[PDB]
Design an enzyme around this catalytic site. Sequence first.
Site, PDB file in Angstrom:
ATOM      1  N   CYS A   1      18.228  -8.020 -46.501  1.00  0.00           N
ATOM      2  CA  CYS A   1      18.746  -7.907 -45.131  1.00  0.00           C
ATOM      3  C   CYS A   1      19.080  -9.213 -44.446  1.00  0.00           C
ATOM      4  CB  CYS A   1      17.735  -7.161 -44.226  1.00  0.00           C
ATOM      5  SG  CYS A   1      18.389  -6.696 -42.556  1.00  0.00           S
TER       6      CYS A   1
ATOM      7  N   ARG B   1      17.771 -10.104 -40.299  1.00  0.00           N
ATOM      8  CA  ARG B   1      16.348 -10.157 -39.925  1.00  0.00           C
ATOM      9  C   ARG B   1      16.030 -11.101 -38.748  1.00  0.00           C
ATOM     10  NH1 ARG B   1      13.764 -11.286 -45.680  1.00  0.00           N
ATOM     11  NH2 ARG B   1      15.931 -11.809 -46.334  1.00  0.00           N
TER      12      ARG B   1
ATOM     13  N   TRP C   1      22.765  -2.299 -36.394  1.00  0.00           N
ATOM     14  CA  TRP C   1      24.210  -2.245 -36.184  1.00  0.00           C
ATOM     15  C   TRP C   1      24.922  -2.950 -37.341  1.00  0.00           C
ATOM     16  CZ3 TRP C   1      21.061  -5.045 -32.596  1.00  0.00           C
ATOM     17  CH2 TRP C   1      21.032  -6.422 -32.829  1.00  0.00           C
TER      18      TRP C   1
ATOM     19  N   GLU D   1      30.867  -4.453 -44.161  1.00  0.00           N
ATOM     20  CA  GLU D   1      30.334  -3.234 -44.748  1.00  0.00           C
ATOM     21  C   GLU D   1      31.291  -2.003 -44.695  1.00  0.00           C
ATOM     22  OE1 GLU D   1      26.999  -0.253 -45.863  1.00  0.00           O
ATOM     23  OE2 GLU D   1      26.334  -2.172 -44.871  1.00  0.00           O
TER      24      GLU D   1
HETATM   25  C1  HEM Z   1      20.311  -5.166 -36.402  1.00  0.00           C
HETATM   26  C2  HEM Z   1      21.335  -5.383 -37.233  1.00  0.00           C
HETATM   27  C3  HEM Z   1      21.169  -5.375 -38.774  1.00  0.00           C
HETATM   28  C4  HEM Z   1      22.027  -5.995 -39.583  1.00  0.00           C
HETATM   29  C5  HEM Z   1      23.303  -6.764 -39.156  1.00  0.00           C
HETATM   30  C6  HEM Z   1      21.608  -5.758 -40.945  1.00  0.00           C
HETATM   31  C7  HEM Z   1      22.233  -6.237 -42.080  1.00  0.00           C
HETATM   32  C8  HEM Z   1      22.111  -5.664 -43.329  1.00  0.00           C
HETATM   33  C9  HEM Z   1      23.143  -5.543 -44.342  1.00  0.00           C
HETATM   34  C10 HEM Z   1      24.618  -6.031 -44.211  1.00  0.00           C
HETATM   35  C11 HEM Z   1      22.588  -4.966 -45.410  1.00  0.00           C
HETATM   36  C12 HEM Z   1      23.290  -4.595 -46.729  1.00  0.00           C
HETATM   37  C13 HEM Z   1      23.285  -3.066 -46.827  1.00  0.00           C
HETATM   38  C14 HEM Z   1      24.173  -2.594 -47.964  1.00  0.00           C
HETATM   39  O1  HEM Z   1      24.812  -3.454 -48.648  1.00  0.00           O
HETATM   40  O2  HEM Z   1      24.227  -1.365 -48.204  1.00  0.00           O
HETATM   41  C15 HEM Z   1      21.218  -4.698 -45.101  1.00  0.00           C
HETATM   42  C16 HEM Z   1      20.310  -4.105 -45.936  1.00  0.00           C
HETATM   43  C17 HEM Z   1      19.029  -3.752 -45.555  1.00  0.00           C
HETATM   44  N1  HEM Z   1      18.456  -3.917 -44.313  1.00  0.00           N
HETATM   45 FE1  HEM Z   1      19.374  -4.607 -42.620  1.00  0.00          FE
HETATM   46  N2  HEM Z   1      20.384  -5.098 -40.899  1.00  0.00           N
HETATM   47  C18 HEM Z   1      20.120  -4.781 -39.582  1.00  0.00           C
HETATM   48  C19 HEM Z   1      19.032  -4.012 -39.176  1.00  0.00           C
HETATM   49  C20 HEM Z   1      18.022  -3.543 -40.027  1.00  0.00           C
HETATM   50  C21 HEM Z   1      16.855  -2.746 -39.659  1.00  0.00           C
HETATM   51  C22 HEM Z   1      16.562  -2.148 -38.241  1.00  0.00           C
HETATM   52  C23 HEM Z   1      16.135  -2.604 -40.789  1.00  0.00           C
HETATM   53  C24 HEM Z   1      14.818  -1.857 -40.980  1.00  0.00           C
HETATM   54  C25 HEM Z   1      13.940  -1.872 -39.980  1.00  0.00           C
HETATM   55  C26 HEM Z   1      16.790  -3.263 -41.878  1.00  0.00           C
HETATM   56  C27 HEM Z   1      16.337  -3.376 -43.185  1.00  0.00           C
HETATM   57  C28 HEM Z   1      17.158  -3.418 -44.303  1.00  0.00           C
HETATM   58  C29 HEM Z   1      16.788  -3.011 -45.626  1.00  0.00           C
HETATM   59  C30 HEM Z   1      15.423  -2.484 -46.146  1.00  0.00           C
HETATM   60  C31 HEM Z   1      18.032  -3.249 -46.456  1.00  0.00           C
HETATM   61  C32 HEM Z   1      18.202  -2.949 -47.953  1.00  0.00           C
HETATM   62  C33 HEM Z   1      18.735  -1.506 -47.966  1.00  0.00           C
HETATM   63  C34 HEM Z   1      18.957  -1.041 -49.385  1.00  0.00           C
HETATM   64  O3  HEM Z   1      18.177  -1.468 -50.300  1.00  0.00           O
HETATM   65  O4  HEM Z   1      19.937  -0.253 -49.584  1.00  0.00           O
HETATM   66  N3  HEM Z   1      17.905  -3.834 -41.374  1.00  0.00           N
HETATM   67  N4  HEM Z   1      20.933  -5.206 -43.857  1.00  0.00           N
HETATM   68  C1  LIG Z   2      20.195  -0.617 -41.035  1.00  0.00           C
HETATM   69  C2  LIG Z   2      21.557  -1.169 -41.397  1.00  0.00           C
HETATM   70  C3  LIG Z   2      22.129  -2.236 -40.718  1.00  0.00           C
HETATM   71  C4  LIG Z   2      23.404  -2.716 -41.054  1.00  0.00           C
HETATM   72  C5  LIG Z   2      24.085  -2.082 -42.096  1.00  0.00           C
HETATM   73  C6  LIG Z   2      23.542  -0.989 -42.779  1.00  0.00           C
HETATM   74  C7  LIG Z   2      24.338  -0.321 -43.879  1.00  0.00           C
HETATM   75  C8  LIG Z   2      24.156   1.205 -43.919  1.00  0.00           C
HETATM   76  C9  LIG Z   2      23.522   0.338 -44.994  1.00  0.00           C
HETATM   77  N1  LIG Z   2      24.352   0.485 -46.149  1.00  0.00           N
HETATM   78  C10 LIG Z   2      24.342   1.790 -46.797  1.00  0.00           C
HETATM   79  C11 LIG Z   2      25.162   1.769 -48.077  1.00  0.00           C
HETATM   80  O1  LIG Z   2      24.223   1.647 -49.142  1.00  0.00           O
HETATM   81  C12 LIG Z   2      24.845   1.576 -50.423  1.00  0.00           C
HETATM   82  C13 LIG Z   2      25.677   0.293 -50.441  1.00  0.00           C
HETATM   83  N2  LIG Z   2      24.642  -0.717 -50.642  1.00  0.00           N
HETATM   84  C14 LIG Z   2      23.581  -0.194 -51.500  1.00  0.00           C
HETATM   85  C15 LIG Z   2      23.766   1.335 -51.478  1.00  0.00           C
HETATM   86  C16 LIG Z   2      22.430   2.045 -51.219  1.00  0.00           C
HETATM   87  C17 LIG Z   2      21.440   1.712 -52.327  1.00  0.00           C
HETATM   88  C18 LIG Z   2      21.646   2.227 -53.609  1.00  0.00           C
HETATM   89  C19 LIG Z   2      20.740   1.914 -54.627  1.00  0.00           C
HETATM   90  C20 LIG Z   2      20.941   2.479 -56.018  1.00  0.00           C
HETATM   91  C21 LIG Z   2      19.650   1.079 -54.345  1.00  0.00           C
HETATM   92  C22 LIG Z   2      19.483   0.556 -53.056  1.00  0.00           C
HETATM   93  N3  LIG Z   2      18.418  -0.261 -52.785  1.00  0.00           N
HETATM   94  N4  LIG Z   2      20.378   0.894 -52.080  1.00  0.00           N
HETATM   95  C23 LIG Z   2      22.261  -0.547 -42.418  1.00  0.00           C
END
Ligand code: HEM
Ligand SMILES: Cc1cccc([C@@H]2C[C@H]2NCCO[C@H]2CNC[C@H]2Cc2cc(C)cc(N)n2)c1
Lengths: 407, 411
Positions: free
Chosen positions: A106, A109, A278, A283
């Site tokens: 993320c 953070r 947000w 994305e």
């Molecule tokens: C406030 C604005 C936030 C921004 C700009 C942001 C940014 C991002 C982005 C760009 C990703 C990549 C997701 C993807 O490629 O699918 C991500 C993943 C992630 N974020 Fe954030 N985040 C935000 C808020 C949060 C919050 C509220 C949480 C949890 C409390 C969080 C926890 C995570 C986690 C656990 C991932 C990995 C998700 C996965 O494995 O698919 N983020 N973040």
């Molecule tokens: C809370 C927050 C803030 C800002 C942006 C987001 C965007 C919505 C989050 N993206 C959702 C799309 O997710 C797909 C694409 N990236 C990995 C996949 C999900 C995924 C798949 C697998 C196999 C593993 C893993 N850890 N995550 C969320």
Amino acid sequence: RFLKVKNWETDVVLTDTLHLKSTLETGCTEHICMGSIMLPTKDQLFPLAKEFLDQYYSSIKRFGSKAHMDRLEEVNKEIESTSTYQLKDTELIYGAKHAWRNASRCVGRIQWSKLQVFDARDCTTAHGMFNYICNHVKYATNKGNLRSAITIFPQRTDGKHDFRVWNSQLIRYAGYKQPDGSTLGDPANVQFTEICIQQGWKAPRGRFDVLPLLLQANGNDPELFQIPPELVLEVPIRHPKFDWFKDLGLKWYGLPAVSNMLLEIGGLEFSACPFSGWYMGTEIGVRDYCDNSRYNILEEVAKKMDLDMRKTSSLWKDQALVEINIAVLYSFQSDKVTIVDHHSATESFIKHMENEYRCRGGCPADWVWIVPPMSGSITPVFHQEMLNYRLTPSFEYQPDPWNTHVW
Amino acid sequence: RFLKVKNWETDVVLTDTLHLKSTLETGCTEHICMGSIMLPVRTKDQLFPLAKEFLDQYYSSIKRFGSKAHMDRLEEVNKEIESTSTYQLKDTELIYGAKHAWRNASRCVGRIQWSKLQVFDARDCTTAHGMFNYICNHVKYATNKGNLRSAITIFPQRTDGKHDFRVWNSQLIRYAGYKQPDGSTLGDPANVQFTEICIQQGWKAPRGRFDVLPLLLQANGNDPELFQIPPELVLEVPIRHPKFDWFKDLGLKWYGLPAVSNMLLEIGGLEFSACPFSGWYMGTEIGVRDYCDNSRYNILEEVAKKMDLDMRKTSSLWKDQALVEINIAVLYSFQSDKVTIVDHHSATESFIKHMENEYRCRGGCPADWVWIVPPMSGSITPVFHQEMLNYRLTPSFEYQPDPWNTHVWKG
Ligand code: HEM
Ligand SMILES: Cc1cccc([C@@H]2C[C@H]2NCCO[C@H]2CNC[C@H]2Cc2cc(C)cc(N)n2)c1
Ligand code: HEM
Ligand SMILES: Cc1cccc([C@@H]2C[C@H]2NCCO[C@H]2CNC[C@H]2Cc2cc(C)cc(N)n2)c1
Ligand SMILES: C[C@H](O)[C@H](O)[C@H]1CNc2nc(N)[nH]c(=O)c2N1
Ligand SMILES: C[C@H](O)[C@H](O)[C@H]1CNc2nc(N)[nH]c(=O)c2N1
Ligand SMILES: [Zn+2]
């Protein structure tokens, strides 16, 4: 044992000490690196509980104090007797925030401490889950002025009684395979969409159909609910210069809210814990619109731009990619929905790494996910070495329940 | 044991068995991944096993594993190591070893080309002047008037590590950098230090924005000496844009031959500390990194200014817009002058086919995702979606610290 991270643009060197508190396995050995791979009892519980409560009481400037030891005892007595334990509210808020703080994938953070936590642990049915979810969606959306939030449902018990949000995000568009061969809507969701109608959804069979929530309460078969349409804030996509853009009929939703993950605090497992912040612009614009397996609209866009699509070296994909992204940012900004660009987000994250090294001795960061999917090297995170390691409390990906569940 | 990599665009799943032949450490542990860290005198004792592995490899590949020829060569190398404490590669071994260092280079996207490599054996070289001449012939053969050919020149191996051959340049052809007293830089800020060593060593610097540096060459552990590559041998391309006629007046040009000279080549345990190799550019190395890194020529502002982009808000994506245009210009300029170049779309597609062929034919393809994904337009290239395993095979190319840090000056 103490490790250096260098920035190759600024020459700043940081020293990581936080990694020796790392506990979980990362997937790499001395022989093989798996950096780019997406998926690399009472007895077991009290260490985990102890480790968490120790960090908790440490953070409140109260390590080794009476209140500290008293709690460790209370928790020990409860595990020994009940087979698990319950978090106090304060611990729960701390746990959730830290799970976000430890999320190495993320970029956002910097914000970790401003997280509204909704304690849905008293929830008992899917209707209840639905109600908590609508309230989350509405509080978070906030008429476009988005606010970070998480909603925490009951923890794992014997494991036959799990709470789960079947959807991977609270708000996603439907996908249907057509007789002509192609795919209408979002190809990422064909499977889930099919399960929706198979459970009885009246699919409109359109292109931007907000999916229905599928909620499992207490390990029961899951149930269908439509999010009130007036709670799903959507944004129609236009270009500040390309007047034809609108005519592609593009929209996206304001609220990204991930709902398939598992939150682990002090060895307790919260299997349903949707959270939302947000969007970073790339994305939607790079991944949701431009991925071959997704909406896949580069070809359409390049055409309207009258670009030379005859050869890859005219960089028409690249030129079109940028405009699609300019359009996503402009639209959200014009409709006043929070959104952040990749330049701004990655800059904030470097500031945040510096803070975590300064204040905590490190920051677990996964470079493969942190560097944006466009314009990597012109953002500062490209040039920043990162160490990736797993800390608790954490968020963990969990398997799609349908693969698992029996009815 | 088996290991799976999946591609998330195609769902194609591959199986790696080759990582089982992996030797060196990665820098990673079960508790820490250092996949994004840039950087994560040999006894008789340790040398014969390394010679043996290598020659087993060499003889397997030519379908003679266990032949008399194989067994005789093993015994022969055993003997040299016994008596002299090192050994000499046969030509055929050197060629095969150099090809394989390339094949095994997990950060290189150009490896579909690994078997077409011109090996120049320069193991009879004894002086820096000798090194200069070898290098001149390399540049000329590699350039080939714009039709670039991959090549490598291999100077004598390390002995006691007191007699190393080194090319002090990081690339054979690079532009000078000069720090001004006001704090700004003229030319390539990446080469300031090396430019200073050159100046200190006697070079008369033109002090322009695109001055080709002189070679600085160490032979036999001796202090290095300066040489100027014949300018007629240094092919250059002036940068212009297909639609924007103002682009040429930015004054940009770049050299055609990317030639890495600072790496150490390991074969059968032997260490070749001077082994410059060259191929041809992928366009993004010039257009993204060389021109647009803030620590490099940094022309983004100037290009967007002239494009009259809105520069008041990063969210206009002005930086992103200027980036593409500059990269269009680089590819256009090279193609128009008939100088070999490859764009990032074509290079990554080609790499994915090489990778799949490698898994079928060899049981794997070690790959560093962080380096293989291009520094612009990441996910619109097929490598972004490709899971990759990174591990270390020999023969190999290893990074060496700059010689000016370690060298014992003789006077
Ligand atoms: C406030 C604005 C936030 C921004 C700009 C942001 C940014 C991002 C982005 C760009 C990703 C990549 C997701 C993807 O490629 O699918 C991500 C993943 C992630 N974020 Fe954030 N985040 C935000 C808020 C949060 C919050 C509220 C949480 C949890 C409390 C969080 C926890 C995570 C986690 C656990 C991932 C990995 C998700 C996965 O494995 O698919 N983020 N973040
Ligand atoms: C809370 C927050 C803030 C800002 C942006 C987001 C965007 C919505 C989050 N993206 C959702 C799309 O997710 C797909 C694409 N990236 C990995 C996949 C999900 C995924 C798949 C697998 C196999 C593993 C893993 N850890 N995550 C969320
Ligand atoms: C034939 C055309 C080639 C192309 C298009 C190509 C592509 C590339 C690119 C773009 C890089 C990264 C550059 C950087 O970030 O500094 C690279 C790295 C590398 N390549 Fe190639 N390559 C080619 C030929 C070769 C040859 C002939 C060799 C040696 C025989 C080689 C070995 C390497 C090595 C060892 C690295 C990593 C360098 C380092 O660690 O600094 N490549 N390749
Ligand atoms: C043979 C061939 C074909 C095509 C392209 C090339 C490209 C031109 C070569 N790039 C040179 C600039 O290199 C800097 C930037 N990327 C790694 C750094 C060098 C470097 C630094 C450090 C700390 C470690 C390491 N392994 N390499 C080579
Ligand atoms: C295989 C590779 O890790 C995969 O395509 C990754 C790359 N980086 C990513 N980065 C983010 N933020 N999200 C992703 O889904 C991915 N996908
Ligand atoms: C910190 C990080 O490892 C570093 O910036 C890397 C990222 N990816 C790269 N990829 C290539 N091809 N060349 C590079 O120099 C780098 N630099
Ligand atoms: Zn690793």
